[PDB]
């Protein structure tokens, strides 16, 4: 595949319906050697299995809320991959009481701090911890959403965190580019992942988008996965600090209702 | 004055060079009645002096780092302004070590947390604490910078904080619009006294903007003259951001 010879670390894989899994599947299909991380011991076994099916036995624990955990994970990784070619950041979180109802009413200093720390800072925290391990030609990738660019009901503070995240992509790309590292993000359209399928009316939402999306269907973890593979491969050597919309063209249209 | 009949709260006055100072002077010139906040004991005197020079005697303490400080401030303001028409959020901060050198090397979890908390969260924090005090037709304004949209050397984490803030503007505008409240931001170009005189040469209007320029745009955005504008980030940088390679 177009990722042959590349070693990529993938986070956020906590289910087969997750975007990180879709991305892993595609990179593996393209010949990349993978390594996975898991948030806590509770997901340890379950993740070692997903990894097994992708030709990998490299499964490390890492809570991005702790600088120590990040440093330890990369140290462990260094034992097998003293050098690798980038990672996929598919991590996000905000307390549940933050993502529902009026934004100004729901947001709190704490909810805000956590959302930005876990959803945005973690991306650069990981980069700092493995910077010396990256090979020239490496590529970092994170996942965003239209909420970073527009006010969307219920997304609330996650919208600010994602806006921070996209800016992070640009500052990271600008700082790491000179050493041969690219940094990009994919703003994905709504997908029914394990986590996503948990929020109320997500079924009806996907239905709404299909009707107003140019390609007339919601994107799949397969679609996102293929674009991710591309963005982490040398085929995208000319792209960096970019937020690629993989939402079927939904954001570039208006009032198709 | 296109601001007569309006009562606005102005934060961030630290000196006569503060953008908030140029803003306050503009609004006063346009007939707005003003109220001021000062961060700490250090700046209290300067603010009282200027508040007085603008016919105001409403000078309250407020450190947006603490929820209690914000509630207390609005509690005091309510004694003289049971209701008002908006406020100018001109507050920003990040530990110094954050704004120098390579971004990836300079940023730290703590520096990131502080920059976002003080520079972005505080804006909605203030809106939360005075929501029921806002009259229909009220307007909120904050200040941002191009660093939010482009990667600018040394600006580092403040760029992410400002990106967060601009998104805050959009979410606040969408949330509060139903109650008759508009929320906007001005992305100001760098104001003359990280040396420049460079932008002053590649900027369309061929000069950097002044706190007077920013002040007038601010007055407008908090006046009924901009009733049709909300959730918008207006670039008041002389057109610098919309040009490329003028060098
Ligand atoms: N689902 C969608 O419709 C959609 C749309 C646009 C963008 N995205 C983005 O895609 C990414 C993946 O989300 P998803 O839909 O696949 O849900 P997901 O539940 O499958 O994965 C999210 C991951 O975040 C990880 N995580 C949270 N806190 C962590 C921590 N402290 N340390 C380490 N890991 C932590 C989780 O464990 C989990 O694996 C996110 O960035 C998300 O916002 C999703
Ligand atoms: N100066 C420029 O060229 C320029 C360009 C673009 C945007 N801005 C923005 O304009 C705004 C004002 O900056 P300025 O140039 O007038 O500098 P300034 O030093 O005059 O004012 C900044 C203010 O922030 C206040 N502040 C900081 N932490 C606080 C806290 N915890 N609680 C309450 N107040 C706090 C300060 O006390 C101070 O008054 C900012 O948002 C800033 O980033 C400035
Ligand atoms: O960013 C997202 C955007 C969409 Cl449309 C659907 C799911 C998303 O991802 C999340 C957002 C907030 C939390 Cl708490 C957890 C997750 Cl998985
Ligand atoms: O945002 C700004 C943009 C420019 Cl061009 C110049 C000054 C700015 O304002 C600040 C940025 C960071 C810290 Cl710590 C304090 C301040 Cl007053």
Query: What are the C-alpha distances in Å from B83 to residues B37, B120, B173?
Result: 16, 24, 19
Q: d(Cα A235, Cα B43) in Å, to the nearest integer?
A: 55
Query: For chain B, what is the largest distance between any 2 Cα atoms, rounded to a whole number of angstroms?
Result: 55
CA-based nearest residue to B145, from B133, B120, B163: B163
Distance CA(B119)–CA(A240), nearest Å, equals 27
| Experimental method reported for this structure | X-ray
Structure tokens at A106: 């729901």
Residue contact A102–B162, C-beta within 8 A: no
Distance CA B67, CA A109 (A): 8
E strand or H helix that includes residue A34: strand A33-38
**Resolution in angstrom units:** 1.9
Q: Do residue B104 and residue A121 have CB atoms under 8 angstroms apart?
A: no
| DSSP H or E stretch at residue A87 | strand A87-89
Residues 100-159 on A with a CB inside 8 Å of B are 102-105, 107, 109, 112-113, 116-117, 120-121, 124-125, 127-128, 131, 148-151, 153, 156-157, 159
- d(CA B215, CA B191) in angstroms, rounded, equals 12
Cα distance between residue A115 and residue A99, in whole Å: 10
Provide the domain limits for residue A154: 1-257
Is A155 a catalytic site residue?
yes
Q: Is B65 in the pocket of ligand 2 (CB under 6 A)?
A: yes
Which residues from chain A sit within 8 angstroms of residue B180, using beta carbons? none
Q: B67: buried, middle or exposed (CB in 10 Å: 19+, 13-18, 0-12)?
A: middle
Report CB contact under 8 Å: A166, B164: no
A161 contacts in B (CB within 8 Å)?
Answer: 164
What CA–CA distance (Å, rounded) separates A181 from A200? 39
Residue B173 CA to ligand 1 centre (angstroms): 27
Contacts 24+ apart (CB under 8 A), A249-254: A249/A213, A249/A214, A249/A215, A250/A146, A250/A189, A250/A209, A250/A212, A250/A213, A250/A214, A251/A146, A251/A149, A251/A150, A251/A187, A252/A214, A253/A212, A253/A213, A253/A214
Is B104–A128 a contact, with Cβ atoms under 8 angstroms apart? Answer: yes
Enumerate residues 24 to 63 of chain A having a beta carbon within 8 A of any beta carbon in chain B: none
Ligand 4 closest atom vs CA B143: 1
Angle A204-A209-A213 from CA coordinates, rounded to 5°: 160
Ligand 2 site, residue B117, Cβ cutoff 6 A: no
Residue (of A162, A155, A165) closest to A199 by Cα position: A155
Both structure tokens of A159: 């919208």
- The total domain count for chain A is 1
Burial grade of B208 (CB within 10 A; 0-12, 13-18, 19 or more): buried
Residues 75-104 on A with a CB inside 8 Å of B are 102-104
B243 vs B241: CA distance, rounded Å: 6
What is the per-residue DSSP string for chain B?
-TTTT-EEEE----STTSHHHHHHHHHHHTT-EEEEEESSHHHHHHHHHHHHHTT---EEE--TT-HHHHHHHHHHHHHH-SSEEEEEE------GGGGSS-HHHH--HHHHHHHHIIIIIHHHHHHHHHGGGEEEEEEEEEEE-GGGTS--TTTTHHHHHHHHHHHHHHHHHHHHGGGTEEEEEEEEPPPP----SSHHHHSTTSS---HHHHHHHHHHHTSGGGTT--S-EEEESTTGGG-----
User: Residue A169 is part of a domain; what is its CATH number?
Assistant: 3.40.50.720
Task: Using alpha carbons, list the distances in angstroms from residue A224 to A20, A218, A253.
Answer: 9, 11, 20
| Cβ–Cβ below 8 Å for B112 and A121 | yes
A117 contacts in chain B (CB < 8 Å): 109, 112-113
Please enumerate in sequence order all residues whose Cβ is within 8 A of that of A86, keeping only pairs 6 or more positions apart, or say none. Answer: A6, A8, A9, A134, A138, A139, A140, A141, A181, A232
Q: Whose CA is nearest to atom 15 of ligand 4?
A: B93
Nearest CA to ligand 3 atom 1: A145
A254 close to B (CB below 8 A): no
Q: Is the CB of B78 under 6 A from ligand 4?
A: no
Rounded to 10 degrees, what is the CA torsion of B63, B68, B70, B76?
Answer: -120
B129 Cα to chain A: minimum distance (Å): 10
CB B23 within 8 A of CB B88: yes
Cα gap A160→B142, rounded to integer Å = 15
CB count within 10 Å of CB B204 equals 13
- Rounded Cα gap, residues B159 and B186, in angstroms: 15
Q: Note whether B89 and B142 are within 8 A (CB).
A: yes
CB contact under 8 A, B167 and A159: yes
Closest to B15 measured CA to CA, from B235, B186, B211, B187: B211
Beta carbons within 10 angstroms of residue B62's beta carbon: 25
Note whether B168 contacts A: Cβ–Cβ < 8 A.
yes
- Picking from B108, B129, B164 by the largest number of A CB atoms within 10 A of its own CB, the best residue to mutate is B164
Using DSSP's 3-state secondary structure scheme, residue A90 falls into: coil
Distances (CA, A) of A198 to A118, A201, A206, A208: 20, 9, 13, 17
The token pair at A209 is 């988008």
Q: Which residues of B touch A160 (CB under 8 A)?
A: 120, 164-165, 167-168, 171
Cα radius of gyration rounded to whole Å, chain A: 17
């Amino acid at each position: 595949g177009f990722l042959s010879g590349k070693r990529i670390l993938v986070t956020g894989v906590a289910s087969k319906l997750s975007i990180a899994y879709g991305i892993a599947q595609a990179m593996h299909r393209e010949g990349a050697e993978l390594a996975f991380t898991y948030q806590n011991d509770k997901l340890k076994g379950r993740v070692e299995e997903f990894a097994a099916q992708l030709g990998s036995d490299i499964v490390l624990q890492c809570d991005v809320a702790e600088d120590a955990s990040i440093d330890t994970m990369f140290a462990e990784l260094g034992k097998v991959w003293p050098k690798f070619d980038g990672f996929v950041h598919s991590i996000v979180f905000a307390p549940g009481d933050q993502l529902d109802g009026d934004y100004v009413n729901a947001v709190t200093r704490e909810g805000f701090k956590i959302a930005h720390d876990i959803s945005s800072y973690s991306f650069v925290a990981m980069a700092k911890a493995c910077r010396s391990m990256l090979n020239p030609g490496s590529a970092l990738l994170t996942l965003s959403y239209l909420g970073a660019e527009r006010a969307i009901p219920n997304y609330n503070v996650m919208g600010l965190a994602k806006a921070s995240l996209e800016a992070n992509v640009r500052y990271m790309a600008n700082a790491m580019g000179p050493e041969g590292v690219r940094v990009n993000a994919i703003s994905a359209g709504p997908i029914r992942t394990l986590a996503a399928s948990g929020i109320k009316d997500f079924r009806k939402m996907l239905a709404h988008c299909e009707a107003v999306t140019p390609i007339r269907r919601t994107v799949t973890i397969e679609d996102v996965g293929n674009s991710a593979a591309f963005l982490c491969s040398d085929l995208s050597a000319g792209i960096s600090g970019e937020v690629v919309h993989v939402d079927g063209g939904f954001s570039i249209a208006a009032m198709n209702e």
